[PDB]
Amino acid sequence: RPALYFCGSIRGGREDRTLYERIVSRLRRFGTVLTEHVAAAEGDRLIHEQDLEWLQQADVVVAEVTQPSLGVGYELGRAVAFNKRILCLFRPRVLSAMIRGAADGSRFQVWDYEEGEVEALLDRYFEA
């Protein structure tokens, strides 16, 4: 099965816990979600090494980029250098030009969305 990596900001996880769970639940239909048991409220070297191992194992990286995060950005930077296929999900805040600009319409895509249509978008992405 394809290996899927999900990540999001700690702030996005706090205010929108259900949103991250909805994304992960939908991703499970298209493969194994390596980060599905991550409980964001979490020495640091062990976390970094496990994160890198999952990033290297992933076939697709799905990042929720609505809130600023050094961790999400760092994971995206490592993922680009690991030549991974990336999908960023943004809820229109101004998305960083480093993320919007990394998009190439194929291997790195950034999709603007409204909370309610996240399942439909994920279906479209993985049925293509």
Ligand X SMILES: CNc1ccccc1C(=O)N1CCC(Nc2nc(-c3cc4ccc(C#N)cc4[nH]3)nn2CCCCCCCC(=O)O)CC1
Q: Give the list of residues 6+ apart from residue 47 with CB closer than 8 angstroms, or none.
A: none
Positive/negative CA dihedral, 57, 110, 72, 25: negative
Residue type, 11: R
91 annotated as a binding-site residue: no
Closest CA relative to residue 92, chosen from 117, 111, 68, 79 = 111
Total interface residues for Cl ion by CB under 5 A: 4
- Interaction between residue 14 and a copy of itself (CB under 8 A): no
- Give me the 68-107 binding string for Cl ion, x by CB under 5 A, dash otherwise: -x-x------------------------------------
| The binder of ligand X chosen from 70, 92, 106, 127 (CB under 6 A) | 70
The entry of Cl ion, ligand X, a copy of itself, none near residue 119 (CB within 5 to 8 angstroms by kind) is none
| The binder of a copy of itself chosen from 18, 37, 39, 70 (CB under 8 A) | 70
| Residue 57 exposed, middle or buried by CB count within 10 Å (0-12, 13-18, 19+) | middle
Rounded Cα distance, 25 and 41, in Å: 20
Reduced to 3 states, what is the DSSP secondary structure of residue 67?
coil
Contact set with a copy of itself (CB under 8 A): 9, 11, 42-49, 51, 65, 67-82, 95-103
- Chain residues binding ligand X by CB under 6 A are 6-10, 13, 20-21, 24, 35-36, 38, 40, 42, 46-47, 50-51, 54, 69-72, 94, 96-98
